[PDB]
Amino acid sequence: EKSKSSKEQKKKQKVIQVKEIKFRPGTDEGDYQVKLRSLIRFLEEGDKAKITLRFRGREMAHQQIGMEVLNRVKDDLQELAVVESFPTKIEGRQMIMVLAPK
Amino acid sequence: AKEDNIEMQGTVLETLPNTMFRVELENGHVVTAHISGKMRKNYIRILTGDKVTVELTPYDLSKGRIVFRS
RNA sequence: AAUGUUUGAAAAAAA
RNA sequence: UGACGCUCAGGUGCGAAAGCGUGGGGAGCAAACAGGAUUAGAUACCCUGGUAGUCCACGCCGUAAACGAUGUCGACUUGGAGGU
Numbered sequence A: 001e002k003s004k005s006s007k008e009q010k011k012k013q014k015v016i017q018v019k020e021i022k023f024r025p026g027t028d029e030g031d032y033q034v035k036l037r038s039l040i041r042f043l044e045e046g047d048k049a050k051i052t053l054r055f056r057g058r059e060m061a062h063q064q065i066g067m068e069v070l071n072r073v074k075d076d077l078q079e080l081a082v083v084e085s086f087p088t089k090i091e092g093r094q095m096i097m098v099l100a101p102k
Numbered sequence B: 001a002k003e004d005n006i007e008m009q010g011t012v013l014e015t016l017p018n019t020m021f022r023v024e025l026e027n028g029h030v031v032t033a034h035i036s037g038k039m040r041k042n043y044i045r046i047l048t049g050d051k052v053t054v055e056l057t058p059y060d061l062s063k064g065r066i067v068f069r070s
Numbered sequence C: 001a002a003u004g005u006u007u008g009a010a011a012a013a014a015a
Numbered sequence D: 001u002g003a004c005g006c007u008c009a010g011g012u013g014c015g016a017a018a019g020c021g022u023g024g025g026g027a028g029c030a031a032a033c034a035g036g037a038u039u040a041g042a043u044a045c046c047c048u049g050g051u052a053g054u055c056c057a058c059g060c061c062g063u064a065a066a067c068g069a070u071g072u073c074g075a076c077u078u079g080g081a082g083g084u
């Protein structure tokens, strides 16, 4: 009971984890708001937020509709987060936007 | 012997429950279309953004039947 | 143990 | 003793736990809550704490899968094995 009472303050150094919220193209407004409120909670507390958008089947045709959702979350969390990386192509069947705390 | 329909192209703007769709047509009018029976039976999926042929009726220009998806 | 392709209408099945 | 019985709408009382009011009490436990995890998320399950409450008095509440899911009273109608 000596080194721990120093290493407690060294442990207090907050460990920023990435919190994954997955959207879809079809995601409705009410459910979008839940997921947005989840993202707000993370970015409020100084946690990074990976934001996937998954396509299924022939939704791969209409990619831009997926991009609208990812664009929208960026806009809603414009003053509460910065875009660490915005996606370009569908890697696999996903587009990942990692946000960061301000 | 039956009365004739009006075929017209349109984009699916949103999907609704139970194979119902909003479809903005060529002329710019948004109709609440439903899937054809033949497309239901043969399992042709329709999605938001898909270009669809829509059979309209003169009795109602707010409704249609999606008969083809391109 | 949110699990384990898409197509189908004018003719599909993982390969 | 000598039919004084049976049932009973309305009525009256009793009625687990939670809960409510007032005043006590408070070891353990523990809604809420706080922190730690888990996870795609985890407003949970898991971990460390923890307040009301759980306890007492008095008053209130009048509900439960308040179940034998079987109203009360009386008579009659083969058997077998147990318990008290």
Ligand SMILES: NC(=O)OC[C@@H](O)C[C@H](NC(=O)[C@H]1NCCC[C@H]1O)C(=O)N[C@@H](Cc1c[nH]cn1)C(=O)N[C@H](C(=O)O)[C@H](O)c1c[nH]c(Cl)n1
Pocket (backbone or CB within 6 Å): D038, D039, D045, D046
């Ligand atoms: N988190 C999420 O969104 O999904 C992950 C979740 O599906 C994990 C999964 N969880 C469970 O079954 C729960 N059972 C009840 C007790 C708690 C928990 O355990 C699970 O497999 N657990 C493991 C332990 C674990 C948690 N995170 C990673 N691993 C586990 O050992 N589960 C046991 C089981 O499935 O039989 C059992 O439930 C158990 C014993 N001890 C604990 Cl703790 N859990």
Ligand SMILES: [K+]
Pocket (backbone or CB within 6 Å): D008
């Ligand atoms: K009476």
Ligand SMILES: [K+]
Pocket (backbone or CB within 6 Å): D051
């Ligand atoms: K307490």
Ligand SMILES: [Mg+2]
Pocket (backbone or CB within 6 Å): D007, D072
């Ligand atoms: Mg009686």
Ligand SMILES: [Mg+2]
Pocket (backbone or CB within 6 Å): none
């Ligand atoms: Mg009580």
Ligand SMILES: [Mg+2]
Pocket (backbone or CB within 6 Å): none
């Ligand atoms: Mg009290």
Ligand SMILES: [Mg+2]
Pocket (backbone or CB within 6 Å): none
């Ligand atoms: Mg405890």
Ligand SMILES: [Mg+2]
Pocket (backbone or CB within 6 Å): none
């Ligand atoms: Mg606990």
Ligand SMILES: [Mg+2]
Pocket (backbone or CB within 6 Å): none
């Ligand atoms: Mg009742």
Ligand SMILES: [Mg+2]
Pocket (backbone or CB within 6 Å): D069
């Ligand atoms: Mg009953």
